[PDB]
Amino acid sequence: DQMX
Amino acid sequence: DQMX
Amino acid sequence: TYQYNMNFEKLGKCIIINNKNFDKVTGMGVRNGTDKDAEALFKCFRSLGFDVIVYNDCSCAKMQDLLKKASEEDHTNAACFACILLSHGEENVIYGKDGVTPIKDLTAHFRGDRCKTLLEKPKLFFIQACRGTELDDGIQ
Amino acid sequence: TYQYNMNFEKLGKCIIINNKNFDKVTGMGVRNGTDKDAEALFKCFRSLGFDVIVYNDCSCAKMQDLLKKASEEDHTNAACFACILLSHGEENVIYGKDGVTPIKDLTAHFRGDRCKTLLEKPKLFFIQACRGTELDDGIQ
Amino acid sequence: QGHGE
Amino acid sequence: KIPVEADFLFAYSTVPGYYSWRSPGRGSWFVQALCSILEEHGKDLEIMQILTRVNDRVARHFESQSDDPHFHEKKQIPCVVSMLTKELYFSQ
Amino acid sequence: KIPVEADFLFAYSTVPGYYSWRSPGRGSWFVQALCSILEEHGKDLEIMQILTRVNDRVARHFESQSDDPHFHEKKQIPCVVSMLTKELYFSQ
């Protein structure tokens, strides 16, 4: 997962 | 009226 | 289910912080009409079933400590928690009689990891205070 | 008397800003997966009855113009308005492909005194974007 | 519409 | 696991950046409205239905009055921030 | 007179100060949740009921996955800000  |  | 479970020994604690008088150095005036708010809130939340406690003219330290201790109490038998703040304020902060303190820090005490007996339970905060100096002229 | 009147010819306009690629200068990475979000959102809001249009990789100026122009259209026959923002962001701001812009400035165009045709009508904003760098470790 | 406990 | 910031609800008397009004004789607009709605529906409506009604009551029933034309006839709209994960009813 | 800030609703994917998560192969957690709920109840539930279920879904069904232990198993809770004055149903 990646952060926004 | 007054402000808070 | 889609509703919070309300089958507990008691509805919960309701803490009311009624700040009317402030130290001269803060530049804040007396909040006339706040005792009427506090009285009405107290009667109202008692009717709902909350165990209400009313604090008056609290310093920033008293407000922080008072909420920290409440979060350390055992809420196991309560369905929820309510806190009502009545005072002057500016964006993101609320006034104690001797100054300003972040609203985030006051409520942080009840975070899931810092108040386990309220985990998965609604934590309500009602805040009567200014959040800036903008005015709404309205339309229509 | 407790629900918004939805008896209008159109449900309303829906703007979806889908920012996936950003200028190297911003240092922000590719938002892989945002295309699936945009498409799934397109179908859902279309299904609700919104007249939706998707705009990809908008610059800050474009996003501003987009919302400003929309606020200047005639919403007399619409029940409401909706805007979905998909991008990188920080507290109070959202990224365009070339930098950040205040969320407040994007939405202010729709205030009652600046968009008469949406007065007393719901104005919805859905924002998928970071609001800081804190992490929630969760509990239990 | 109809909300209900 | 449950998010640590989950299950909070903040019912603010006004929106970010704005003043909040209080009548020395009757109390703050927000509190008057909240108690009024709670006294009549506190035990039969969901918390958000209650607060939405408070929003409407504060927005429509109040207007400021000051000898100063600068703070005359001003309006106010509350602000509800919810991180609740379920509907909340005060009864049963 | 109507307050100029009245009738707005902001549905944020996360609370102030925090990150918001997105899965490269499935999309952001918030949107996945929003769409699944709208697809199933978009036309029969009030907007707050819908967003409340979205908060629950995001809070319970998601947990970050990363090699870096610093971003391992993190959670998220959306944030709903409502200045609405009535109940909103997308129908009739």
Order of helices and strands of chain F: EEEHHE
Please state the oligomeric state of the protein chains shown: heteroheptamer
Counted by DSSP, the helix tally of chain E is 0
Structural class of chain E: little secondary structure
* Count of individual helical segments of chain F: 2
Terminal CA distance of chain E: 14 Å
Q: Per the principal axes of the C-alpha atoms, what is the gross shape of chain E?
A: rod-shaped
Rg from alpha-carbon coordinates of chain F: 15 Å
Number of strands of chain E: 0
CATH class of chain F: Alpha Beta
Rg of chain E, alpha carbons: 5 Å
Strand content of chain E: under 5%
Biggest interface, which chains? D-G, 51 and 53 residues
Indicate the percent of residues in helices of chain F: 25-40%
The main pleated sheet of chain F reads as:
2 strands, antiparallel
Number of strands of chain F: 4
User: Could you give a short account of the major beta sheet of chain E?
Assistant: none
Beta fraction of the residues of chain F? 15-25%
Summarize the amount of helix of chain E as a percent range: under 10%
The CATH topology of chain F comes to Alpha-Beta Plaits
PDB class: hydrolase/hydrolase inhibitor
Keywords: cysteine protease, apoptosis, thiol protease, zymogen, hydrolase-hydrolase inhibitor complex
Assembly: heptameric
Entry title: Crystal Structure of Caspase-7 with inhibitor AC-DQMD-CHO
Descriptive overview:
The complex is a heteroheptamer, with 2 copies of chain A (4 residues), 2 copies of chain C (140 residues), 1 copy of chain E (5 residues) and 2 copies of chain F (92 residues). By secondary structure, chain A is mainly beta. Chain A has no helices and 1 strand. In chain A, 0% of the residues lie in helices and 50% in strands. Chain A is rod-shaped. A 4-stranded parallel sheet of chain C has the order 2-1-3-7, with helices on one face. In chain C, strands 4-5-6 form a 3-stranded antiparallel sheet. Chain C has one domain (1-140): Rossmann fold (3-Layer(aba) Sandwich). In chain C, a hairpin with a 2-residue loop joins strand 5 (93-96) and strand 6 (99-102). Chain F is of the alpha+beta class. Chain F has one domain: Alpha-Beta Plaits (2-Layer Sandwich). Chain F has helices spanning 29-41, 47-61; strands at 8-12, 21-23, 27-28, 79-82. In chain F, strand 2 (21-23) and strand 3 form a beta hairpin. Chain F starts with 7 loop residues before the first strand and ends in a 10-residue tail after the last strand. The relative contact order of chain F is 0.27. Chain A binds chain G through residues 1-4, and chain G through 13, 19-24, 28, 64-66, 71. Chains C, D: This is Caspase-7 subunit p20. Chains C, D: Residues 20-31 are annotated as: Loop L1. Chains C, D: The active site is at 88, 130. Chains C, D: The modification Phosphothreonine is found at residue 117.
